Amino acid sequence: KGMRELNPNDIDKLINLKGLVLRSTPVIPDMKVAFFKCNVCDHTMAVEIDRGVIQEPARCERIDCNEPNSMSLIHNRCSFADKQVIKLQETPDFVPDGQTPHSISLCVYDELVDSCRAGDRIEVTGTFRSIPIRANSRQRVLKSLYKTYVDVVHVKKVITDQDLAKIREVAAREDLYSLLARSIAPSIYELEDVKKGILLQLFGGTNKTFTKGGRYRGDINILLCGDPSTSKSQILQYVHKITPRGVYTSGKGSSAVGLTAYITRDVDTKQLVLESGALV
């Protein structure tokens, strides 16, 4: 379903959504089983929580001691679970006429906590729940408009021995260099040396950990300068697709600070933080 097609009819039903993660709150402890201790006889009992309500006892459950209202909650002995709140923004494609994309809040508990990072495309299955909002802190009064959110039950972020036996077969091929150089950029024609140079950058040198000095890194830097119409930008895009991480920065569209890192402040936490530039 689309984020703009959820109606009241579809409340309390299992739906499937896809979107982009925008922001996630830190871990929130959610109580599961409460712990009570009698102030008089030092008797301890555990009571369950139903619908966010503690089934507190009126008086001590022991027979000899029955002092009413003498039970107290020991905060640090109650069982707890994990809770987290995420904000999901619909994919840019779904936007009908170029407006601000809508967002829907999600809740994930236990294992699914810290499963999706900020700025990732995920597909989430959960229950489309509804819940009241209290008009003010100090009253049971409720607003007539209900808040909508999704109770997530599954999240999907959108080597075998057989493969290893297969991979080891290619390495035996005598013309492996040509095969890989021809497969890295199928479309580009008669640039075998350029392709070979590009390929060796993906593999990279060898890493060395080195005390009594500094680390030595096997990273290769390549410059492709030549006449305009030749396939330079095409190879740039082709390699940009293959690599797992990379930023397609251009000329005059990037800044000195923008490449390295930007100093900023976090509004939510009100602390000085720094972002990661294109190079970082």
Partner: peptide, 12 residues
């Protein structure tokens, strides 16, 4: 003159 009840520590 007054009504009082007592809770003993040994009862713990």
């Amino acid at each position: 003159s007054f009504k009082s009840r007592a809770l003993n520590h040994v009862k713990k």
